[PDB]
């Protein structure tokens, strides 16, 4: 933009969609068991169940909602 | 040509000038006409001047004229090349006929 940067929306290709999917899930469970009594198995099970519900109490679904909102804003 | 794109070939008075040209000027005109026949962007102009000549001179004279069947001999093969390419273009142009068939059949 010559100095005036701006976010434009683009569509995304399924190998990128699957790579985001896997990264989002595992980063969510690692940082949810960063320092707790929980461990990777239990937090990751928590996350996979919730995300498969889609129930939006979960890391990856929150970040997905964020990214379609940002596209929805400035397409 | 461009003005005469609307039995004449060019404007008629111009045709009369070409008809009453001299022999020496016919040689010089066909020298320049062969030169423009070389490339394929001025071939139309070359072909039209040639056709105007052939239709408005005595052909036995034109064969007779000294040092000209050399030039004529260099003129044929490039015109066969052009003939073949333009005929190829008619050939590709039957696509539109195909597409019309397909569209009416959909319709």
């Amino acid at each position: 933009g010559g100095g005036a940067a701006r976010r434009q929306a683009v569509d995304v290709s399924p190998l990128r969609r699957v790579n985001q999917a896997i990264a989002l899930l595992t980063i969510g469970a690692r940082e949810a068991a960063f320092r707790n009594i929980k461990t990777i198995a239990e937090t990751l099970a928590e996350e996979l169940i919730n995300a498969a519900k889609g129930s939006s109490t979960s890391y990856a679904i929150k970040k997905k909602d964020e990214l379609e909102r940002v596209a929805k804003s400035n397409r | 040509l461009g003005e005469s794109r609307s039995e004449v070939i060019f404007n008629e008075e111009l045709d009369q000038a070409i008809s009453i040209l001299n022999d020496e000027q016919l040689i010089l005109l066909m020298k320049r006409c062969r030169d423009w026949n070389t490339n394929a962007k001025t071939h139309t102009i070359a072909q039209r001047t040639i056709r105007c000549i052939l239709m408005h001179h005595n052909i036995a004279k034109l064969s007779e004229i000294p040092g000209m069947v050399k030039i004529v001999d260099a003129i044929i093969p490039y015109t066969q090349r052009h003939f073949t390419r333009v005929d190829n273009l008619v050939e590709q142009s039957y696509i539109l006929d195909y597409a019309l068939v397909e569209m009416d059949k959909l319709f």
């Binding site: - | 461009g2 040639i50 052909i59 036995a60 069947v69 008619v90």
Partner: protein, 842 residues
């Protein structure tokens, strides 16, 4: 490290210039170099001058020789003066505030003619390189440029808003139409070089290069060559050398003058039809006392015209101008080459000059050296001396910038002054020393036969008691003042010519050049041959030695100042300077710093300890001949062959995408105008044609075709792959439109056809999936028209191929020799067929 700036310029009364005369004798404009000057004729007193503010020498100034002011002509109705300088720059001055109001720079070479009508404020200029510019003063921009000549411009006559008639330095005359804005007619005028052009409403008079003036009749008739210019006659016999300027004038018998390049100028009268009929009858009675009418048609030119008279004026003239009164006086202002401006008058009663000779009034030669200055001298910071080979020893006061006394002494060479008695001494190219007084007459004791050759250099000791005169007799002579006569006392007879002499300010050394590239340095007190300095490869021209006898500066013809230390006789420092040649060099009177003036119009100021040109001075444009430095003040007076005296005082897009944008604009204009056509047809307001189409003046098909043409063939497949389907529909409509315009179609048939077939093969699935009766109708039109075009072109090709084969076959079976035996004719054929060589790898 002070810096010097120019303060003055004398003797520059009129040179290299074309004068413009103002009636009130009234005042007159000439130009100095780089500068204008105006004055009253009868008093001869300067009024004003115009130049840029910063002088050459302020360190802001640029390192280049300044532009000479080469033409000027005025407009009294608006009272402006348009001058043109030989860098081809046009400056217009106000004459009341004497300030510039605007400038112009369109040419490249020097400007010859300005000619301008303030009526609409049209300015017309013709320079040394062949184009004519026309301008408007009110808009101060470039209107336009007329260019078809080849060598230069020497004359042109405007007429109204319609025509120019111009002549070049290669001898052809060209008439230009200003509407269609271009050449119409051309005629070669004379064999060599035509120079002058002057127009009366009937007839046009031009000059050749060898005293043949030619006479045309001019009209406004509208044949091709006919009607316009016709070739009435040839008059001649002015001089032998060619003329330059012709001007008409009237009261009503009219007159015109030819100004030549020689000493002379000519004036003619042009008669009236009554005298024409009278001479016709007289000549016809001589005819009777047919082909004889052809003879009188041949003597036409001398029949109509008439040699009024001449002026065998003096030496040489630059410019001239008319003045008429009473039908009994014609007057010429006359700017010479040498520094004179003269008035000339002639009586007449519309019949005859009534005078044995033209009369010379009001010369102006007073403050102008009138020849070439050969030397300068400064005297006691108050007094200035200028000598020139007319002898015209002009004595000047600086602070008045003006002359005091003038003498004459023949071809003077070198000047010097005597503070004692305030008496000046000169020497010539003949061996005669001439010593002059200032209050009284010049000649006091004019010595002759002092030297059998030209003398060259001359100096006096720090007291003013003796004179050393070195002269091309290969001798130097030493002379003493007796009381006030001069007596030679002794002579040193060397081997070669003397080119300069100087003595120390402490009076101990004598420096004498030779014709060999050598200089000798003698002890003054007893003539002892103390040293010999060697090595300039070309002779020394000018010598200095220091203010205190420490160093010696020698400057020679091979462009290298040498600085010698005087004690042991060593060369300190060599210095290549001054691309032509050095004429002289001078010290500051206090310190080891020194000025140097060349033959190529630069004055270079040096430091004598870093040995660098501190400053370069770019005042003027001739061979600088001499220089002298104030005894204290640091102002320096430089004098040069341009008869001039200067004083320095001390102080974007991707292809394919641009196709889409063109496609949008084109389809928009097309469909809008179509809808408006539908509107008027239903009736029985123009939708506005867009800026790009209007501004380039291109119809929409030509626009889109031009973007398609500019795209390159490596990017054409990718581009048509890039556009979306909607733009493909637009593309199909565009192809329909060019089929409407057949001439464009047959012009660019391969481009169109290739693009069409590619874009359809690529978008085929969409294309058949679209159902639109518009699209079916469009495809029928496009397909039928493409077949018509390709088919008729092909039919030409077939006819030509058959015909040329028939021609060759006929000539074969009549000329080329035929055999019967098959092997024998096969031998013949493999002889005579075309053979082409080819480089095979084996």
């Amino acid at each position: 490290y002070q810096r010097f700036e120019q303060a003055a310029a004398f003797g520059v009364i009129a040179s290299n210039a074309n004068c413009v005369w103002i009636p009130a004798p009234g005042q007159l404009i000439t130009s100095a170099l780089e500068d204008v000057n105006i004055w009253d004729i009868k008093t001869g007193d300067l009024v004003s001058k115009l130049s840029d503010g910063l002088p050459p020498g302020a360190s802001d100034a640029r390192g280049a020789k300044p532009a000479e002011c080469t033409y000027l002509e005025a407009h009294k109705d608006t009272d402006l003066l348009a001058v043109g300088y030989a860098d081809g720059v046009i400056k217009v001055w106000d004459l009341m505030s004497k300030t510039v109001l605007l400038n112009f720079n369109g040419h490249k070479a020097a400007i010859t003619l300005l000619q301008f009508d303030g009526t609409g404020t049209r300015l017309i200029s013709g320079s040394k390189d062949s184009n004519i510019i026309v301008w408007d003063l009110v808009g101060e921009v470039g209107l336009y440029k007329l260019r078809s000549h080849k060598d230069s411009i020497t004359g042109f006559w405007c007429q109204g808003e319609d025509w120019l008639i111009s002549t070049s330095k290669d001898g052809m005359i060209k008439l230009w139409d200003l509407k269609t804005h271009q050449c119409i007619e051309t005629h070669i005028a004379h064999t060599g070089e035509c120079w002058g052009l002057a127009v009366k409403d009937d007839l046009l008079i031009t000059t050749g290069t060898d005293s043949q003036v030619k006479i045309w009749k001019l009209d406004i008739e509208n044949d091709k060559m006919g009607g316009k210019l016709t070739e009435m006659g040839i008059f001649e016999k002015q001089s032998k050398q060619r003329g330059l300027k012709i001007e008409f004038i009237t009261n009503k018998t009219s007159f015109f003058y030819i100004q030549n390049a020689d000493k002379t100028i000519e004036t003619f009268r042009i008669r009236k039809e009554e005298e024409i009929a009278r001479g016709l009858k007289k000549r016809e009675k001589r005819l009777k006392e047919e082909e004889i009418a052809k003879s009188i048609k041949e003597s036409y030119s001398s029949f109509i015209l008439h040699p009024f008279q001449t002026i065998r004026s003096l030496y040489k003239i630059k410019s001239a101008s008319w003045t008429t009164v009473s039908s009994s006086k014609l007057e010429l202002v006359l700017t010479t080459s040498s520094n004179t401006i003269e008035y000339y008058s002639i009586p007449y009663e519309k019949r005859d000059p009534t005078s044995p000779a033209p009369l010379k009034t009001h010369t102006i030669e007073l403050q102008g050296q009138r020849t070439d200055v050969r030397s300068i001298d400064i005297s006691d910071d108050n007094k200035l001396l200028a000598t020139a080979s007319n002898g015209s020893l002009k004595i000047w006061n600086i602070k008045t910038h003006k002359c005091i006394r003038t003498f004459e002494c023949g071809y003077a060479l070198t000047c010097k002054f005597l503070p004692g008695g305030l008496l000046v001494i000169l020497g010539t190219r003949n061996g005669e020393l001439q010593l002059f007084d200032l209050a009284s007459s010049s000649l006091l004791d004019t010595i002759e036969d002092a030297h059998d050759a030209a003398i060259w250099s001359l100096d006096l000791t720090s007291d003013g008691k003796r004179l050393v005169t070195g002269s091309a007799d290969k001798t130097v002579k030493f002379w003493d003042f007796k009381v006030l006569k001069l007596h030679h006392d002794t002579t040193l007879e060397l081997t070669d010519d003397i080119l300069c002499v100087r003595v120390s300010p402490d009076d101990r050394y004598l420096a004498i050049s030779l014709l060999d590239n050598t200089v000798k340095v003698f002890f003054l007190d007893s003539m002892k041959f103390y040293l010999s300095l060697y090595g300039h490869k070309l002779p020394v021209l000018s010598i200095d030695i220091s203010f205190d006898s420490k160093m010696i500066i020698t400057s020679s013809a091979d462009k290298n100042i040498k600085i010698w230390g005087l004690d042991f006789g060593d060369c300190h420092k060599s210095l290549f300077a001054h691309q032509d040649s050095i004429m002289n060099v001078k010290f500051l009177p206090q310190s080891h710093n020194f000025f140097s003036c060349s033959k190529d119009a630069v004055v270079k100021y040096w430091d004598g300890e870093k040995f660098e040109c501190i400053q370069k001075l770019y005042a003027h444009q001739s061979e600088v001949w001499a220089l002298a430095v104030a005894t204290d003040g640091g102002f320096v007076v430089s004098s040069s062959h341009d008869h001039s005296i200067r004083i320095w005082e001390e102080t974007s897009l991707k292809a394919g995408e641009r196709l889409m944008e063109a496609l949008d604009l084109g389809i928009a204009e097309i469909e809008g105008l179509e809808a408006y056509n539908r509107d008027m047809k239903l009736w029985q307001i123009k939708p506005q044609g867009n800026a790009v189409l209007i501004a380039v003046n291109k119809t929409p098909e030509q626009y889109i075709m031009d973007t398609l043409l500019r795209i390159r063939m490596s990017q054409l497949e990718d581009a048509l792959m890039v556009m979306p389907f909607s733009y493909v529909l637009k593309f199909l409509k565009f192809i329909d439109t060019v089929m409407q315009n057949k001439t464009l179609l047959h012009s660019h048939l391969p481009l169109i056809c290739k693009n069409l077939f590619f874009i359809i093969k690529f978008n085929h699935k969409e294309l058949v999936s679209q159902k639109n009766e518009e699209l079916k109708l469009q495809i029928n039109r496009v397909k039928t028209e493409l077949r018509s075009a390709l088919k008729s072109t092909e039919d030409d090709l077939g006819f030509n191929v058959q015909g040329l084969k028939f021609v060759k076959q006929q000539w074969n079976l009549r000329h080329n020799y035929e055999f019967v035996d098959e092997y024998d004719q096969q031998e013949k054929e493999s002889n005579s067929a075309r053979k082409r060589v080819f480089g095979t790898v084996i």
